[PDB]
C-alpha cells in the first residue's frame, strides 16, 4: 500500500497516494516490455512476472534475463493461459 504501478508503452513505475496530507511521486522508465498479453505482481516485489505473445519470462527489480531454452521451448504462439501453483 505504498506505490501504484500504471503504464502502456512507458514501462514506468508510479506512486499511489492514500488519503492523508503526505503523497509520493516516482519515475522509473524501464526497458520496453511492450506487447505483453497481461501483467501481474509478486509478493516480495523483488520479482516481476512477464509473458509475451510468442511467450517469454522477463524478471525485474523495483529497487532503483529470459530463457526459453533447455526443456520444451517449442516455437509457437502463447495464449492467455497462466496461473499460480502451491
Amino acid at each position: 500500500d505504498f506505490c501504484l504501478i500504471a503504464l502502456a508503452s512507458g514501462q514506468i513505475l508510479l506512486t499511489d497516494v492514500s488519503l492523508e496530507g503526505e503523497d509520493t511521486y516516482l519515475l522509473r522508465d524501464e526497458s520496453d516490455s511492450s506487447d505483453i498479453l497481461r501483467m501481474a505482481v509478486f509478493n516480495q516485489q523483488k520479482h516481476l512476472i512477464t509473458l509475451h505473445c510468442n511467450g517469454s519470462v522477463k524478471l525485474w527489480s523495483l529497487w532503483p534475463n529470459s530463457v526459453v531454452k533447455r526443456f520444451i521451448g517449442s516455437y509457437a504462439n502463447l495464449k492467455i493461459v497462466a496461473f499460480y501453483l502451491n
Binding site: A6, G10, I12, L14, Y25, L27, N65
Partner: protein, 508 residues
C-alpha cells in the same frame, strides 16, 4: 621470467572476439565466475561489448581462477582457441613482450589503475574507435566538467593492446597542468625532448629572447619526430590549460587532449578533429557502474551499497567513498563531506578568475535555490557593481570557463553545477535581505486585475517563496499568495503528465 595467464590473456582478443560468444557457453563453475557475473555479460548487445566485458571481469580475479579458466575452455567443444593461448609458455611472441612490458611502465603511474577504477564501456568504446583511426595530423578532444574522470578513460584505452600495437609502443605523456607564459612552456616542452632521445646539445644559442628560443627547439623537435621510426607516435596532453599552449606542440602527429575549459573545445573544430564529451548523458556512469566503483573502496557486500543515488562524477564520488573507509560521515551522515579535499580541489579550480571583477560574483550566486534556472534579466539585479549589458558580457566571460555559468541559452542562466555551488557557506555579509528582498522587485507591482497576469516565466511559480524566506513573514503571509487564488493555480498550469491520469512521465 615465466609469464602468467592474466598477464598475457588480454593480448589476443580479435580471434577470441569474433568466433566465440560468451552466451554460447555458461558452464559456470561457480568459483571462477559468480552467477551475477555471467548474468551481466550476456546482457551486452554485441560481441565487441560482449567479448570485452569478459576480460575485465577475469583480470579482476586471482590467477588460480584464470589458471583454471584456460583449462576450462578445453572441456568445451572448442579447444582450438586455447592452443594458441598455451603459447604463453616459452613463447611470448617477440612483439608481445614489447606490450606486456610497457603496460607495466604504464601502471607505474601506480595509484591510478593500481587499485581504483572500474573501466567504463560507452566512453571507452567510442574512443578506441576514433583513436584507432586518426592519421598523422589529427586530434581527439576529451571534454569533461570538473572531475568526471577524463584523465583515466584517457589512460585506460591507451592501455588496450590493439591500440598499443597500432602506434608502435611509443606513447609519451605530459602535463600542462601548470602551463602559462613562455618560460613554463619551454620547460614542459623541453622535458618532452629528452624522452625522445637522450641527446640534445644546447647548441642553438642561449640568446635571452625566450620567444625565439623555443621556436628553435620546436623546430629541432618537429623534424626529428616525423623523421624516423617514431613515425607513428602520439603525444598525450592532460589538462591543457592555455589555449595557446596548444600551439606549442602543434608540430606533432596523433596528439590527444583533455580539457576543462570551453574555450578550447570551441577553438578546435570538427573539421580536423573529433570530440568525446563526457557530459553527454549516454556517456556517463550507468548507475550500475557506481555500484562497482563505490564498492572497491568500502569493501562490503552489495547489501552495504548506498541507496538514494548520490551523483555521477568519479570525482566527489571518491571523496565520499574515501571519507567513509576512513574518516567521518558514517556513510549515513554526510553533509560535511570532507570539505577540505572537496574544497582544496574546487577552490584552486576557481583561481583563474579576476577576483574583484569576478570572484565577488559567484558569492552572489549562492542566492539561488539549487538545480533551477535563473532568468538572465533577473540576474541584472544581483551585482550592480558593473552595469548594463555587462550581464551578458559577464556570463559569457564566465561561461567560457567550463560550465561555471552552465548556459541554457534561453532568456536565462543555469546553475554551474552542484560543485561550484556545493563549496561553502554563501557569506557575502550584507547581501541577504536587500538582495533576497529587493529581488522580489517584480510582483508587488501586479496585484489584482482581469485575465492572465504578466508574471515571469517558469522561475517565479517555483522559488519566489524562497526569496520570501528572507522577508517579513506577515508581509509574505499577505503576499505569499496562500491567500491569492489567482496567481497560485498558474503554477500547475504548465504541469501535465506524459501518461495516464497522473503527474510526470513529464512533470509533477
Amino acid at each position: 621470467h615465466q609469464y602468467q595467464y592474466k598477464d598475457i590473456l588480454s593480448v589476443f582478443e580479435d580471434a577470441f572476439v569474433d568466433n566465440f560468444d560468451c552466451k554460447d557457453v555458461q558452464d559456470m563453475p561457480k568459483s571462477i565466475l559468480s552467477k551475477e557475473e555471467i548474468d551481466h555479460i550476456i546482457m551486452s548487445k554485441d560481441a565487441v561489448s560482449g567479448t570485452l566485458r569478459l576480460f575485465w571481469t577475469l583480470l579482476s580475479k586471482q590467477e588460480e581462477m584464470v589458471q583454471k579458466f584456460v583449462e576450462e575452455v578445453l572441456r568445451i567443444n572448442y579447444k582450438f582457441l586455447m592452443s594458441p593461448i598455451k603459447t604463453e609458455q616459452r613463447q611470448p611472441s617477440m612483439m608481445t613482450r614489447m606490450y606486456i612490458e610497457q603496460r607495466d611502465r604504464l601502471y607505474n603511474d601506480n595509484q591510478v589503475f593500481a587499485k581504483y577504477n572500474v573501466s567504463r564501456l560507452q566512453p571507452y568504446l567510442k574512443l578506441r574507435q576514433a583513436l584507432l583511426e586518426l592519421r598523422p595530423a589529427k586530434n581527439v578532444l576529451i571534454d569533461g566538467v570538473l572531475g568526471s574522470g577524463k584523465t583515466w578513460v584517457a589512460l585506460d584505452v591507451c592501455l588496450s593492446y590493439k591500440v598499443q600495437c597500432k602506434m608502435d609502443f611509443k606513447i609519451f605523456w605530459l602535463n600542462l597542468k601548470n602551463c602559462n607564459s613562455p618560460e613554463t612552456v619551454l620547460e614542459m616542452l623541453q622535458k618532452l625532448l629528452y624522452q625522445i632521445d637522450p641527446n640534445w646539445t644546447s647548441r642553438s644559442d642561449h640568446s635571452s629572447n625566450i620567444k625565439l628560443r623555443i621556436h628553435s627547439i620546436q623546430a629541432e623537435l618537429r623534424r626529428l619526430l616525423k623523421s624516423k621510426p617514431y613515425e607513428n607516435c602520439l603525444l598525450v596532453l592532460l589538462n591543457v590549460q592555455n589555449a595557446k599552449a596548444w600551439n606549442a606542440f602543434n608540430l606533432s602527429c596523433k596528439i590527444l587532449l583533455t580539457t576543462r575549459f570551453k574555450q578550447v573545445t570551441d577553438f578546435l573544430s570538427a573539421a580536423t578533429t573529433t570530440h568525446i564529451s563526457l557530459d553527454h548523458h549516454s556517456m556517463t556512469l550507468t548507475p550500475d557502474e557506481v555500484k562497482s566503483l563505490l564498492l572497491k573502496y568500502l569493501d562490503c557486500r552489495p547489501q552495504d551499497l548506498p541507496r538514494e543515488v548520490l551523483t555521477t562524477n568519479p570525482r566527489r564520488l571518491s571523496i565520499i567513498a574515501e571519507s567513509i573507509r576512513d574518516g567521518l560521515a558514517t556513510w549515513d551522515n554526510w553533509k560535511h563531506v570532507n570539505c577540505d579535499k572537496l574544497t582544496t580541489i574546487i577552490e584552486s579550480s576557481l583561481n583563474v578568475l579576476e577576483p574583484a571583477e569576478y570572484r565577488k560574483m559567484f558569492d552572489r550566486l549562492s542566492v539561488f535555490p539549487p538545480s533551477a534556472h535563473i532568468p538572465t534579466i533577473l540576474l541584472s539585479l544581483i551585482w550592480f557593481d558593473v552595469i548594463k549589458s555587462d550581464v551578458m558580457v559577464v556570463v559569457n566571460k564566465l561561461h567560457k570557463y567550463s560550465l561555471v555559468e552552465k548556459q541554457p541559452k534561453e532568456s536565462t542562466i543555469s546553475i554551474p553545477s552542484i560543485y561550484l555551488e556545493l563549496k561553502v557557506k554563501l557569506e557575502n555579509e550584507y547581501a541577504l535581505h536587500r538582495s533576497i528582498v529587493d529581488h522580489y522587485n517584480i510582483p508587488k507591482t501586479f496585484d489584482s486585475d482581469d485575465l492572465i497576469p504578466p508574471y515571469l516565466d517558469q522561475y517565479f511559480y517555483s522559488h519566489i517563496g524562497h526569496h520570501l524566506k528572507n522577508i517579513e513573514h506577515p508581509e509574505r503571509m499577505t503576499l505569499f499568495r496562500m491567500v491569492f487564488l489567482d496567481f497560485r493555480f498558474l503554477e500547475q498550469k504548465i504541469r501535465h503528465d506524459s501518461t495516464a491520469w497522473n503527474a510526470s512521465g513529464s512533470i509533477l
